[PDB]
Amino acid sequence: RTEKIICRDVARGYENVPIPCVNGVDGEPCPEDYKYISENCETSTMNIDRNITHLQHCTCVDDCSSSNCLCGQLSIRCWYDKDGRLLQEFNKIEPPLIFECNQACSCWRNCKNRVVQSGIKVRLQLYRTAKMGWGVRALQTIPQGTFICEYVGELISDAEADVREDDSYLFDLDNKDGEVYCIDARYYGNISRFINHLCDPNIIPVRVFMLHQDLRFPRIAFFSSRDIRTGEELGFDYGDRFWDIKSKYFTCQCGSEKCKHSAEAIALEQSR
Numbered sequence: 314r315t316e317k318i319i320c321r322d323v324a325r326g327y328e329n330v331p332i333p334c335v336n337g338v339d340g341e342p343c344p345e346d347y348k349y350i351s352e353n354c355e356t357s358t359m360n361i362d363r364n365i366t367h368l369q370h371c372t373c374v375d376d377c378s379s380s381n382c383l384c385g386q387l388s389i390r391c392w393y394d395k396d397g398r399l400l401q402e403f404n405k406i407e408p409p410l411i412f413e414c415n416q417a418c419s420c421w422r423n424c425k426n427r428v429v430q431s432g433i434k435v436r437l438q439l440y441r442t443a444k445m446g447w448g449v450r451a452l453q454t455i456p457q458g459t460f461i462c463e464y465v466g467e468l469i470s471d472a473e474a475d476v477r478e479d480d481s482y483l484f485d486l487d488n489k490d491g492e493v494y495c496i497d498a499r500y501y502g503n504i505s506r507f508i509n510h511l512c513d514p515n516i517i518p519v520r521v522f523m524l525h526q527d528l529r530f531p532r533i534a535f536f537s538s539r540d541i542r543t544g545e546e547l548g549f550d551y552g553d554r555f556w557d558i559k560s561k562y563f564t565c566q567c568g569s570e571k572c573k574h575s576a577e578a579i580a581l582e583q584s585r
């Protein structure tokens with residue numbers, strides 16, 4: 314049973330790098346029951362505030378590496394090192410909101426505070442897992458704090474999320490208050506839609522603002538939470554909102570010693 318290259322690039326050239334699909338496990342064809350999009354899309358009236366006069370922006374004439382950069386200060390500080398990687402001290406538990414530089418800023422497009430807006434740089438692969446369907450793995454080593462990819466899909470309201478038949482591809486956009494919105498990657502999504510849950514995760518979501526600062530719509534950036542080895546499967550914690558609903562349909566197959574959502578773990582808690 315050989316590992317076969319089934320698609321040279323599921324992103325159809327929309328990313329900085331190709332994202333190939335292989336399958337060495339079963340007869341599943343390349344997934345095509347969805348539309349690959351590299352950036353979030355709208356299917357109803359959202360009115361994202363794109364007023365350029367509403368952007369907070371810096372007056373930096375350097376590379377935005379100084380603590381005097383307004384955009385960094387909105388983020389508490391800029392959290393990216395000279396190489397575009399999150400600082401070791403970054404709060405991976407309760408990440409702060411990141412405000413990247415933007416088109417109102419006086420700085421250049423290559424300033425130090427533009428990691429997420431610059432897109433995917435690591436080589437990834439869509440591959441058939443043993444027990445969890447499709448998954449995404451690294452084709453190279455990835456240091457801690459590296460930007461991996463964005464959780465991209467269809468923006469929907471809370472009310473629309475409430476009636477979506479498939480709730481498997483939802484991501485909540487947390488905001489101080491208000492109407493609350495979700496990304497649904499079921500019908501429209503990028504590579505992130507294929508990232509599985511791991512009880513021992515190696516990536517974390519961070520809310521980021523770039524070309525707009527409409528707080529209803531943070532963009533969701535995945536960064537590595539530790540060093541990742543070539544071939545390693547990417548995964549994040551889907552959280553209890555997911556597992557509270559899904560546990561009765563199926564159980565976690567992440568296979569970790571720490572697995573908290575396996576059949577075994579659920580039964581042990583049922584039993585108390």
Ligand SMILES: CNc1cc(C)nc(Nc2ccc(OC)c(OC[C@H](O)CN3CCC3)c2)n1
Pocket residue numbers: 470471474475476480481482483484485493494495550551552554555556558559
């Ligand atoms: C069903 N109505 C709503 C409404 C709002 C505002 N938010 C949600 N969130 C939600 C519902 C179900 C979910 O999984 C079963 C869920 O999972 C979130 C979790 O991040 C996992 N997704 C899978 C890819 C990321 C979120 N649902």
Ligand SMILES: C[S@@+](CC[C@H](N)C(=O)[O-])C[C@H]1O[C@@H](n2cnc3c(N)ncnc32)[C@H](O)[C@@H]1O
Pocket residue numbers: 444445446447448481482506507508509510511559563564565566567
């Ligand atoms: C966002 S999709 C991830 C991509 C999915 N594996 C696929 O093939 O399209 C989430 C769904 O993948 C599966 N999945 C993800 N993480 C899992 C896990 N730890 N154990 C079992 N199934 C998992 C479940 O069917 C889940 O509802």
Ligand SMILES: [Zn+2]
Pocket residue numbers: 371372373376377382383384385414418420
């Ligand atoms: Zn600046």
Ligand SMILES: [Zn+2]
Pocket residue numbers: 371373376377414415418420421424425426
């Ligand atoms: Zn800048």
Ligand SMILES: [Zn+2]
Pocket residue numbers: 370371372377382383384413414415418419420426
């Ligand atoms: Zn700036």
Ligand SMILES: [Zn+2]
Pocket residue numbers: 511512513565566567568569571572573574575
């Ligand atoms: Zn698990």
